[PDB]
Nucleic acid binder design. Structure first.
Ligand SMILES: Nc1ncnc2c1ncn2[C@@H]1O[C@H](CSCC[C@H](N)C(=O)O)[C@@H](O)[C@H]1O
Ligand SMILES: OC[C@@]1(O)OC[C@@H](O)[C@@H](O)[C@@H]1O
Ligand SMILES: OC[C@H]1O[C@H](O)[C@H](O)[C@@H](O)[C@@H]1O
Ligand SMILES: OC[C@H]1O[C@H](O)[C@H](O)[C@@H](O)[C@@H]1O
Ligand SMILES: OC[C@H]1O[C@H](O)[C@H](O)[C@@H](O)[C@@H]1O
Ligand SMILES: OC[C@H]1O[C@H](O)[C@H](O)[C@@H](O)[C@@H]1O
Ligand SMILES: [Cl-]
Ligand SMILES: [Cl-]
Ligand SMILES: [Mn+2]
Ligand SMILES: [Zn+2]
Lengths: 300, 109
RNA sequence: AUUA
């Protein structure tokens, strides 16, 4: 924790690593499992989400009035939602925040949906999607590390159908919890990266961040190759655990930019509109009421 | 009939019961207004800020609220000397309606 | 993955 990156909230995958064509190898971190020293009484996920938000503060996120944020995998074994509490602290006052999890939990969100994420429906679009979902069965490694389906299939469809143009995502992955189609969708944003929090530098965990959704492929990404590139980066670039950025919260709140919100048909999305989307200066979606629901399977 | 969750927790603590854990403590500047319940963390140098829902006995125990939940979606500031039991502090204390701080910890109403 |  003496390298200049130790004062940052975390480390983003460098561009040259994204341009390689590596074969998938076993992830082997020299500090695997080591614990970070956190400020007294601070939970790991408050520190982790604080560093994710500090990093998102450096990107061109669109931040309109009445911003809409949905948080998947917001519950925990503690029965509370530490990540949601940090999102609520970070987002401008008045931001609509919806969260969800397979298991019941108490939340600071405006609305909470309990059930498999595949049961969640919304006839509305979102400005920011955060996912911390992880399938416990991913720990049972009995074969080749292949692209995983489950909630990742739902997240890819949710991004393609419910993310507003100009919107952004942060989706948690790990060495074994990953999806090739999700990496491919990162090529549908103005910019993307794999971000590792400094407090969890000893984990293969990263947040795949898509910044400013364009709804069309800007670059063609092979998801198998890109995950192999991600693991290669992690295997050859040890990151020192660091909680340094957690001590300066003076510039933490996301700045309300009042980003313009417009409704436009796909036939009106010209290069001038794409430029505004790419700079975080425009959100394209309806501004109707937010309605959400969870499908309930009825059994006798 | 009505189950008095509040008295039951006060009695539990009096008999040496361990305080409710997992109240979500937030990272903040500790240069805030110091008010009791706020839309964002406002802890001063003598307080800790916690996510409201995690400090509400009714939310945590999955019980009906005695009324609407005034803590859910907000942040509660707890004196650092009492931060070991945020749920207990929110029950045993009251907020000065005018000032906005806890009675006996900055104000008196 | 929900550090210690
Ligand atoms: N298919 C699915 N649908 C919904 N939630 C799922 C899911 N698969 C896994 N999850 C959830 O993903 C979560 C991973 S732990 C999340 C911790 C939480 N983000 C925090 O702030 O502490 C678990 O709560 C698990 O129930
Ligand atoms: O609920 C109070 C608290 O101090 O209990 C022990 C740990 O669970 C802490 O995170 C929590 O804030
Ligand atoms: O706060 C800025 C920090 O980052 C700088 O790049 C230096 O590496 C470090 O000495 C400094 O404290
Ligand atoms: O050109 C790409 C640049 O703009 C993107 O929108 C990102 O926010 C920024 O991190 C990146 O350096
Ligand atoms: O919602 C949280 C629960 O589900 C998660 O998948 C974890 O495996 C489990 O430990 C936790 O109690
Ligand atoms: O525990 C290993 C390291 O991680 C912590 O988060 C701190 O940043 C550092 O002081 C400590 O040495
Ligand atoms: Cl799968
Ligand atoms: Cl910001
Ligand atoms: Mn870890
Ligand atoms: Zn409550």
């Amino acid at each position: 924790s003496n390298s200049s990156q130790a004062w940052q909230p975390g480390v983003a995958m460098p561009n040259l690593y994204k341009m390689q064509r590596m074969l998938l190898e076993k992830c082997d971190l020299q500090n695997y499992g080591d614990s970070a020293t956190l400020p007294k009484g601070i939970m790991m996920n408050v520190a982790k989400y604080t560093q994710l938000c500090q990093y998102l503060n450096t990107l061109t996120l669109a931040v309109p009035y009445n911003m809409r944020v949905i948080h998947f995998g917001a519950g925990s074994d503690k029965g509370v939602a530490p990540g949601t509490a940090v999102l609520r602290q970070w987002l401008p006052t008045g931001t609509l925040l919806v969260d969800s999890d397979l298991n019941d939990f108490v939340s600071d969100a405006d609305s909470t949906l309990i059930g498999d994420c595949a049961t969640v429906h919304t006839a509305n679009k979102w400005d920011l999607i955060i996912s911390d979902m992880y399938d416990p069965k991913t720990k049972n490694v009995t074969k080749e590390n292949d692209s995983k389906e489950g909630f990742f299939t739902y997240i890819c469809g949710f991004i393609q159908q419910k993310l507003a143009l100009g919107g952004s995502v942060a989706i948690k992955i790990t060495e074994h919890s990953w999806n090739a189609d999700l990496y491919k969708l990162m090529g549908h944003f103005a910019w993307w990266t794999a971000f590792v929090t400094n407090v969890n530098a000893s984990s293969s965990e990263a947040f795949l961040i898509g910044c400013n959704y364009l709804g069309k492929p800007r670059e063609q990404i092979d998801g198998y190759v890109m995950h192999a590139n991600y693991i290669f980066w992690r295997n050859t670039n040890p990151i020192q655990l660091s909680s340094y950025s957690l001590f300066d919260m003076s510039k933490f709140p996301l700045k309300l930019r009042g980003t313009a919100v417009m409704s436009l048909k796909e036939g009106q999305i010209n290069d001038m509109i794409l430029s505004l989307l790419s700079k975080g200066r425009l959100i394209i979606r309806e501004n109707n009421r937010v309605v959400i629901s969870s499908d309930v399977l009825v059994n006798n | 009939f009505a189950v008095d969750a509040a008295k039951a927790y006060k009695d539990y603590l009096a008999s040496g019961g361990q305080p409710i854990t997992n109240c979500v403590k937030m990272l903040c500047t500790h240069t805030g207004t110091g008010q009791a319940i706020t839309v964002t963390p406002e802890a001063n140098m003598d307080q800790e800020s916690f996510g409201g829902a995690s400090c509400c006995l009714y939310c945590r125990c999955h019980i009906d609220h005695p009324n609407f939940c005034d803590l859910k979606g907000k942040y509660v500031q707890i004196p650092t000397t009492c931060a070991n039991d945020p749920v207990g502090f929110t029950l045993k204390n009251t907020v000065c309606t005018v000032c906005g701080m806890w009675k006996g910890y900055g104000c008196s109403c």
